[PDB]
Structure formats: C-alpha cells, structure tokens
C-alpha cells in the first residue's frame, strides 16, 4: 500500500496548502483560484473513486511524511481541530472539501 500511503500523504499536503491558498478568498480577483480548487476537488473525488476507520488510527499515522513536506505542526493541528469540530475518515475529509468548495 505504498502508492496508497503516498496518495494519502499528497492528499493531506495539498489539502493543507490549499487551505493556505484559500485564506485570501475566505477572509473577503481570486476567482481563478476558486475554479482551480473546484477542478482540484473534482479531480480528488475522481481519483478516490479510482482507488475505491477514525482519525486517531488512520489520519494520525501519516504525520511524519506530510510533516516532512510541510514542517508546521500548528497547521496540522488546525486541520485536525477543524475535522474534530466538523464531526472511514476519507469521506469526512472529502465532505469537508465539498463544504469549503461551495463557499
């Protein structure tokens, strides 16, 4: 499941760096980034369907690889706190992406 593990790593890394990029749009000309994020979340839905639990067993085991790509533990804990306040957890993260995509 090494391809599966690096896919989850890239999913969390791109989720965090799209959270950072949409911070300008969320806090009130970035419509190019909005349609790009919509195409990105549709691509991730299609890729998850091409492939096809809880946070503390499944999302918390890809901490090291994602944190080598990113190196900011506070952003990881903000992501985890937002998913904890929202509620396998892949469906939870994708539902979070759909709810952020429409707004």
């Amino acid at each position, epitope marked *: 499941h090494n391809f599966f593990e690096m896919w989850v*790593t890239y999913l969390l890394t791109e989720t965090i760096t799209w959270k950072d990029k949409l911070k300008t749009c969320m806090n009130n000309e970035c419509n190019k980034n909005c349609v790009c994020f919509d195409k990105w979340v549709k691509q991730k839905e299609d890729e998850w369907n091409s492939i096809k639990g809880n946070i503390n067993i499944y999302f918390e085991s890809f*901490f*090291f*690889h994602v944190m080598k790509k990113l190196n*900011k*533990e*506070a952003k990881w804990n903000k992501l985890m706190d937002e998913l904890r306040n929202k509620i396998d957890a892949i469906e939870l993260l994708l539902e979070y992406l759909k709810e952020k995509s429409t707004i």
Partner: antibody, heavy 124, light 99 residues
Framework: QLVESGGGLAQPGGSLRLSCAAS????????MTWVRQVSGKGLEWLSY????????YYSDSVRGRFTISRDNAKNSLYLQMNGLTDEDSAIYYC??????????????????????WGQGTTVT | PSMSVSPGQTAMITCSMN????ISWYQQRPGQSPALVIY???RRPSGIPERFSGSNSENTAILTITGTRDLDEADYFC???????????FGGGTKLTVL
C-alpha cells in the same frame, strides 16, 4: 526491552563509547534516541537517528562533537563521544523513538513522544 | 519552578512556549527512568490510568493531573519541537511536590 553497556569513568578527553541493544522490539522501523540527564537536573536531548539511518539530528552543543550509528541486524545502537568535559557527567538513557517511521522521515517530536526509556549507564 | 500541591487536587503545570508544538509529558520517578504519559496532546498509551489529562490551547500546555497521588512525585517535562532548527526543546521540568 533495552539493555545497556559502556558507561563508567572518563578523564577529560575522548574515546568513550556506550552501547544499547534492543531486545524484543522492532528495531528496524522505529526511531532511536539518546538523552542525558545530570543528576539533580533535567533532561537534555543530544542525538537522534531515523529508521533508515539516513538522517540524524543533534543539539547545538553536541553537533559534530558526538556521533551515532545503528546496526539493524544485531539491533544495537552505539553512542560515541569525543572531547568530554565536566559538564558531560550525566546519566545517558538510550531511548526508543516513538512512532512508526514511514520510510526514514523520523524526528523526535512530542507528537509521537519517546515511549521507551532504557535504564542507562552512569558516565562520570 | 515547582508547585506544592496537596494530594487529591488538580495540578496546573504550564510551560507556555510561544510557538505551538505537540507537547508530551514524562513522569520521572526518582532514581528511575522517565516514561511516556501523554502524547499528541490528548492521547495516552495503555498501562497508565485515565487520570493524566493534557491540552495545549492559546499557546499554553497544561497537564491536568486529576487526583494527584503520592506516586506522582516527579519532574514533568514538556517535549516541544522547533522545525526551524530541527532540535527538540525539552522543558525545564517542575518538581511537583506531593504533600
């Protein structure tokens, strides 16, 4: 369970090596840590090594002065020192680095913590 | 520093580091190696009871010990992390005196 050897007495100078062998643990895919502790004082992290032994971190006082390398076959980790002074008289605990280590991306965070601490040997 | 806390009450041990990292805690029995108590700021391994609780909010790491016992005489160290210098920052530790 961690077993230790190599501690004792040292004059100022170098050439003193400790050993720590991991018994009953999965030494191949876990990180490994050594932390010293002066008696009556607190902990002080010195060196860390990843699962694949391709990355290693050190403190600001022991970087380059100390060295560390692991043998994944016999499951024994050594710590080698040079230039010992009077401030290095501490209790050196060999520590299993907590977590699971996907590939060699290991670093001793407080996230996974440092789960298993050995008994350690006294360095004078 | 230290806090003289009577047995059975709540101890509030703070490091209050400005940069956020996941803070672990260790119960160092005297003459004994430390052991992992709380990791990922909420979680806890098997073999230790539920009474050790922790959190880190508003840049302050609080290890809430509910029901402090005589066996809790230990120096409790924060385990930080600094990704800028790649060196872990152990806390100074507090001699949590149990009366």
């Amino acid at each position: 369970q961690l077993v230790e050897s190599g501690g004792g007495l040292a004059q100022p100078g170098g050439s003193l090596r400790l050993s720590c062998a991991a018994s009953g643990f999965t030494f191949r895919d876990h990180g490994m840590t050594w932390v010293r502790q002066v008696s009556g004082k607190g902990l002080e992290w010195l060196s860390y090594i990843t699962a694949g032994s391709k990355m290693s971190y050190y403190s600001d006082s022991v970087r380059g002065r100390f060295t560390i390398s692991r043998d994944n076959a016999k499951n024994s980790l050594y710590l080698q020192m040079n230039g010992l002074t009077d401030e290095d008289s501490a209790i050196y605990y060999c520590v299993k680095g907590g977590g699971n280590c996907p590939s060699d991306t290991c670093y001793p965070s407080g996230y996974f913590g440092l789960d298993v601490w050995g008994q350690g040997t006294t360095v004078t | 520093p230290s806090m003289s806390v009577s047995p059975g009450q709540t101890a509030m041990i703070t490091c209050s580091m400005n940069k956020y990292s996941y803070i672990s805690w260790y119960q160092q029995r005297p003459g004994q190696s430390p052991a992992l108590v709380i990791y990922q700021d909420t979680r806890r391994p098997s073999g230790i009871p539920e009474r050790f609780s922790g959190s880190n909010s508003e840049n302050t790491a609080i290890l809430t010990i509910t029901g402090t016992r005589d066996l809790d005489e230990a120096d409790y160290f924060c385990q930080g992390w600094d990704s800028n210098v790649k060196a872990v920052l152990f806390g100074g530790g507090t001699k949590l005196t149990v009366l």
